Structure 1
Amino acid sequence: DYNYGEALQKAIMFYEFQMSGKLPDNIRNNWRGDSCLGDGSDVGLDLTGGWFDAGDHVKFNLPMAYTATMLAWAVYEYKDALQKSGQLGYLMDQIKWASDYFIRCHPEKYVYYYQVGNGDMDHRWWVPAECIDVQAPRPSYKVDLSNPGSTVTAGTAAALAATALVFKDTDPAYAALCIRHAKELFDFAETTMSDKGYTAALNFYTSHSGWYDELSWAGAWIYLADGDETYLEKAEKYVDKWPIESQTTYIAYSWGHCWDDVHYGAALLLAKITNKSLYKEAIERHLDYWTVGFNGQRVRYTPKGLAHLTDWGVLRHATTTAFLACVYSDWSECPREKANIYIDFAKKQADYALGSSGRSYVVGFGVNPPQHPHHRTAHSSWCDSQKVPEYHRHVLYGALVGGPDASDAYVDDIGNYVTNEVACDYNAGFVGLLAKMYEKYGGNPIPNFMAIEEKTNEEIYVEATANSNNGVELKTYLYNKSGWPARVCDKLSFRYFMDLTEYVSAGYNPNDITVSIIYSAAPTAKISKPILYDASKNIYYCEIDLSGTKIFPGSNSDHQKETQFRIQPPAGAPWDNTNDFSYQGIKKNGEVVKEMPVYEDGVLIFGV
């Protein structure tokens, strides 16, 4: 059988790679650093934190809130299994990472920021998370009473209520904070009944289904968190506003639970809360359609057994429905025959994602996993190209990709933003599915698993050429191809070492040597007079300081800065470049000159 504990371990770790903001020191990788620390600065608020949505760096709160709710749902249903796997703490930390962010986005009762970053502006740049905020502004978008967003506020209410539910025993004060914000956001959504102000997510996370399903979703979670029947009643109030399967009176059943349709999960929760036939029949009708069929109709299946609802995020849909199948099949009121059908269906969808069709569709897991997920920071280009490097510098452990077509066909290409898309909501229900599969079938996680990668290219270094000319003239490029993690540097300098024995032995003062910047792409570039390095051997160096100029792996030729400079003695003084340490290195290998060491804020970071 497949190792569900390892899969669960990695599916949860995936969210660490999506973290935005000032990162905790207990992350388990060496290739994510601080990012987007100025989020919210355009409106005078701290709106850092949360997750980047997909392979981009926009923070879309509707799918982010959906994700957090689903992860908390996994905790709620499968806490003990998650504890045993060793991953419950990390999952809870990720849930709180998102929820802390939602709370900051809600500075007053009827004002909610639902997006940080602009989709069109953000997606123009194929650069790592640690550099994206240098390339374009990241505006903060909000809804309020004059420009409302019932769908996203209700969605966030559900996330904070679900967070309160799972934290109320271990952190009563935080749960009380979450539940208050939840009820306020619910009232906000219910008061406005409109998405008129929810515009910044157009073409990315538009709500075609509206907010009535979200109101039942949020109401049910609020009730579960603190037992307020006022919100269960409101949740049931809006059931008759849910989508209806056309040509029938049935609650819609032929799609699936996802970020833009939560009435499937809402029906399941309301079923367990009230045991009412309406909800039990609705969810059974849905799960039947996905398994054995309903009234002569059944979801499409690939020849190799994948339930194939659509071509967009097909594995996201199959694994999420499987999760719901797990929850309902574990319920005592679920008819036994179909409890077995449902859980058998859930395992097969889990096993398809993990490799039953011949390859894994989970990055970094199993047999022949995808290697080119459509993900900027895991690829980690230093020059704003999907094609450079031609392989990902990092392994996005645990990422469930979009998946194959209805014939099980699939191509692993970074440019296929459909088959190789990855996203927060793709892994959300997946985590809960793997929790149940671990609870039932086991599979040992990797002990103390850490995503500490080997650095496969030199991050920061000088490339240089030189020519002798009554002294020396240097043409240098100071590179920042950092990757572990990518980072912006603005305090970089390097040293050029010389042996001035022939010069000082002839009676000349090193301070009369001319040092000059000829040209530099760094406007702050400066060069020091010779500095004594070894009084016994008359070794000196000149410091070329580019502090003040950003050098980072991004676009606009920012991953390198050219500096041309000259070091020339007074006319007539002896000069021998051939005994100069840095000159010798340049002529040995100008590509990477260890003999011109690089310093960041005065600390050596490369070279001898």
Structure 2
Amino acid sequence: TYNYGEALQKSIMFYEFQRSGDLPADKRDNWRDDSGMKDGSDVGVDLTGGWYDAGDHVKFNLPMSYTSAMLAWSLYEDKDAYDKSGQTKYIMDGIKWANDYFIKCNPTPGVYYYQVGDGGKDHSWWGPAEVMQMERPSFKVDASKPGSAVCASTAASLASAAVVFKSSDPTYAEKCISHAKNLFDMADKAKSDAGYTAASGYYSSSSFYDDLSWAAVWLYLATNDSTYLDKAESYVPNWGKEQQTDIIAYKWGQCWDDVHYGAELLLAKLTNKQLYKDSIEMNLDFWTTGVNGTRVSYTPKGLAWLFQWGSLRHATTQAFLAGVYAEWEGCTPSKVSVYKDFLKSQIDYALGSTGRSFVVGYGVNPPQHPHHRTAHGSWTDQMTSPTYHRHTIYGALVGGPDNADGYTDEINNYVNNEIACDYNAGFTGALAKMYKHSGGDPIPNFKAIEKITNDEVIIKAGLNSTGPNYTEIKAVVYNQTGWPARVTDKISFKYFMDLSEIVAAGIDPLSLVTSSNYSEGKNTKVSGVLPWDVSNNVYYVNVDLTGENIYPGGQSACRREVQFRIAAPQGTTYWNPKNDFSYDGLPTTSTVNTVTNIPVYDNGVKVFGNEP
């Protein structure tokens, strides 16, 4: 027995944590903030927004548009489930988030930016989205350098968004259609992926006629112009055949690189032509009862297993298509129960039928180490530290087990433990169907405002050098921010002393010499002695780090060391560090430890430690 409503709620929420750009004031978390704010600056176009692809920060438009098209398809099929669960606003905000970005990516007729970020450079750094420091180049396709698959996948997303938004926001629906029409025209004129090269190694395209059909079907549903339905059907002979036959491929499943499964399902419902009915049932039969002596492999515990990478992604996506098709009056009657049983068995495997959940922050023993940079929240550019994720990325469906149900919840296992937009796409639609059928209430007013689990900015210190007339401190400030991760360019700290002995010597405490033999950072400034509470002879040295680009993204990047000394005159012996507030407990060597008596300030406001 599983709570499908809560699963649906979290699956939709997952996308909110993948958001790039200027985040809404109404966001329900305290650990994601503005990021990729300069996206498109290299080309002079505002390309901010959209979703980060997986556990990384590249914006790959092919799987991104596949995702939003699939979410819109679910809303088109099961609006009643979203309304009943109270999740309609959230899934529509997600669909609009992706589509607003695709619109920005088509700034002028005939031009389409299909990517922001370099796979290699982006993947070479392990840290939060908010503090990325590397270049994020924009890439585009046009008539001279075509991208049929990505243009058509984007048109499908835009057109499907138009279908589900038309009732409540007819103007946005028209806006989506205008851009879908342009991108489809680009894809249809070109019939080539030759200029779609920036995603090589990550989302290279192996087919585009499937995307042309899928986009044409959605443009037909969005505009009711039969010109599109005729085009949709015209590409069918060009879809890849099953190896060793002259039959439309049926041994794989709906995914970001192959959408002919969804296109044929939709063409079956729209035309009732036997060709489409036979094709989709051949695929669904292969995945369930088996067909013509062949069948997708099943793990011992009941998972329809298609491939090593994202096994759950494949199974839950096929579950969604099986659910949609089983509801159609044209489905072979005897297969309705078979397909519906399949939808339930596969979704249940993801939610907990093996004894544990494969959905982050949901169910029994959910994964705790998904391969995801921002949810982990390292501040040292290390997958290994901290040894636990600082944030809970609710709703994320992990890759999944191997062919024998084997699974290792480790952060470095990106084959079976990464999470991604496309992984949750079909999954979300299958969950909506299970919810409408078996229920399970979503958590009321669900938010992801987390407790701060570690001091965000800390200071470590130790006695570096000492003498009869001086004290020399080694201090290191650390940015361990996570709610949200952020640059701390206004940090300072204060070192307090009791100078009663200086006053007793007839010496002005303000005349003591302060100095610094070493400091990381160009802006580090150590002040002279300043009064704090002279009635109790308390003075201090202010160490200002304002201007320093301290950020949680590397061992050096997150810290600033400062060695400073305060000294009475040469030959004197009255200097007494033992009555100094900041000296108490201070480590006796240059081995530094966290101290609570050399307070840290952020723009003058105390955030760590204590004052006298």
Deviations 1:485-534 (A, max 9, x none): 22221221111122223323544334322222321111110022333322
1:522 counterpart letter in structure 2: G
Moved more, 595-604 or 420-429: 595-604
- What is the distance in 1 between the residues matched to 2:504 and 2:10? 65
Superposition deviation, residue 592 in structure 1:
2.2
Partner of 1:235: 232
Superposition deviation, residue 246 in structure 1:
3.3
Partner of 2:487: 488
Deviations 1:241-276 (A, max 9, x none): 112223433221111000000010011112222222
1:104-115 to structure 2, matched below 5 A, reads: 104-115=104-115
Contact 1:468/1:577 (<8 A) preserved: no
Superposition deviation, residue 355 in structure 1:
1.1
Partner of 1:272: 269
Moved more, 403-412 or 150-159: 403-412
1:72-471 to structure 2, matched below 5 A, reads: 72-131=72-131, 133-134=132-133, 136-208=134-206, 210-466=207-463, 467-469=465-467, 470-471=469-470
2:234 counterpart letter in structure 1: K
Instruction: Find the residue that maps to 2:267 and give its secondary structure.
Output: helix
Contact 1:158/1:182 (<8 A) preserved: yes
2:155 counterpart letter in structure 1: A
Partner of 1:598: 600
Deviations 1:76-106 (A, max 9, x none): 1111211221222111111111111111111
2:180 counterpart letter in structure 1: A
Instruction: Find the residue that maps to 2:586 and give its secondary structure.
Output: helix
Moved more, 343-352 or 326-335: 326-335
Instruction: Find the residue that maps to 2:381 and give its secondary structure.
Output: coil
Partner of 2:20: 20
Contact 1:517/1:525 (<8 A) preserved: no
- What is the distance in 2 between the residues matched to 1:163 and 1:301? 35
Contact 1:154/1:215 (<8 A) preserved: yes
Contact 2:379/2:555 (<8 A) preserved: no
| Pair 1:172–1:569, CA change in 2 (3 A) | farther
- What is the distance in 1 between the residues matched to 2:482 and 2:488? 12
Contact 2:587/2:593 (<8 A) preserved: no
Deviations 1:197-217 (A, max 9, x none): 111100100111x21110111
- What is the distance in 2 between the residues matched to 1:487 and 1:533? 30
2:22 counterpart letter in structure 1: K
Contact 2:475/2:592 (<8 A) preserved: no
- What is the distance in 1 between the residues matched to 2:604 and 2:334? 70
Moved more, 32-41 or 150-159: 32-41
Contact 1:363/1:395 (<8 A) preserved: yes
Contact 2:515/2:564 (<8 A) preserved: yes
Instruction: Find the residue that maps to 1:250 and give its secondary structure.
Output: coil
Contact 1:508/1:573 (<8 A) preserved: no
1:124 counterpart letter in structure 2: S
Superposition deviation, residue 576 in structure 1:
2.3
Deviations 1:93-142 (A, max 9, x none): 111111111111111111111111111111111112222x21x2111111
Instruction: Find the residue that maps to 2:359 and give its secondary structure.
Output: coil
1:189 counterpart letter in structure 2: A
Superposition deviation, residue 69 in structure 1:
0.6
Give TM-score, length-normalised by structure 2.
0.95
Partner of 2:510: 511
Instruction: Find the residue that maps to 2:462 and give its secondary structure.
Output: strand
Contact 2:474/2:592 (<8 A) preserved: no
- What is the distance in 2 between the residues matched to 1:439 and 1:69? 21
| Pair 1:531–1:170, CA change in 2 (3 A) | farther
Contact 1:525/1:563 (<8 A) preserved: yes
- What is the distance in 1 between the residues matched to 2:486 and 2:122? 18
Superposition deviation, residue 344 in structure 1:
0.9
- What is the distance in 2 between the residues matched to 1:23 and 1:604? 27
Partner of 2:545: 546
Contact 2:74/2:428 (<8 A) preserved: yes
Deviations 1:389-416 (A, max 9, x none): 2222222221111111111121222221
Partner of 1:43: 43
Instruction: Find the residue that maps to 1:464 and give its secondary structure.
Output: strand
Instruction: Find the residue that maps to 2:297 and give its secondary structure.
Output: coil
1:517-532 to structure 2, matched below 5 A, reads: 517-532=516-531
- What is the distance in 2 between the residues matched to 1:216 and 1:453? 44
Instruction: Find the residue that maps to 1:43 and give its secondary structure.
Output: coil
* Identity within the alignment, %: 61
2:212 counterpart letter in structure 1: L
1:445 counterpart letter in structure 2: P
- What is the distance in 2 between the residues matched to 1:219 and 1:514? 77
Deviations 1:212-239 (A, max 9, x none): 1101111111111222222222112212
Superposition deviation, residue 573 in structure 1:
8.7
Identify unmatched segments of 5+ residues in structure 2: none
Give TM-score, length-normalised by structure 1.
0.96
Deviations 1:560-596 (A, max 9, x none): 1111111223455943222221122535996222222
Deviations 1:312-365 (A, max 9, x none): 111100000110111111122223221111111100000011111222111221
For these two proteins, the number of residue pairs brought into alignment is: 605
Instruction: Find the residue that maps to 1:487 and give its secondary structure.
Output: coil
| Pair 1:24–1:569, CA change in 2 (3 A) | farther
Superposition deviation, residue 474 in structure 1:
1.0
Contact 1:503/1:573 (<8 A) preserved: no
Moved more, 72-81 or 431-440: 72-81
Partner of 1:479: 478
- What is the distance in 2 between the residues matched to 1:465 and 1:382? 23
| Pair 1:165–1:505, CA change in 2 (3 A) | farther
Contact 2:65/2:157 (<8 A) preserved: yes
- What is the distance in 2 between the residues matched to 1:607 and 1:236? 69
Identify unmatched segments of 5+ residues in structure 1: none
Contact 1:511/1:529 (<8 A) preserved: yes
Superposition deviation, residue 538 in structure 1:
2.9
Instruction: Find the residue that maps to 2:30 and give its secondary structure.
Output: coil
Contact 2:11/2:394 (<8 A) preserved: yes
Moved more, 581-590 or 448-457: 581-590
- What is the distance in 1 between the residues matched to 2:499 and 2:162? 70
- What is the distance in 2 between the residues matched to 1:178 and 1:527? 57
Contact 2:461/2:587 (<8 A) preserved: no
- What is the distance in 1 between the residues matched to 2:561 and 2:84? 54
Contact 1:585/1:594 (<8 A) preserved: no
- What is the distance in 1 between the residues matched to 2:142 and 2:574? 75
Instruction: Find the residue that maps to 1:431 and give its secondary structure.
Output: helix
Instruction: Find the residue that maps to 1:536 and give its secondary structure.
Output: helix
Superposition deviation, residue 381 in structure 1:
1.7
Partner of 2:535: 536
- What is the distance in 1 between the residues matched to 2:255 and 2:89? 25
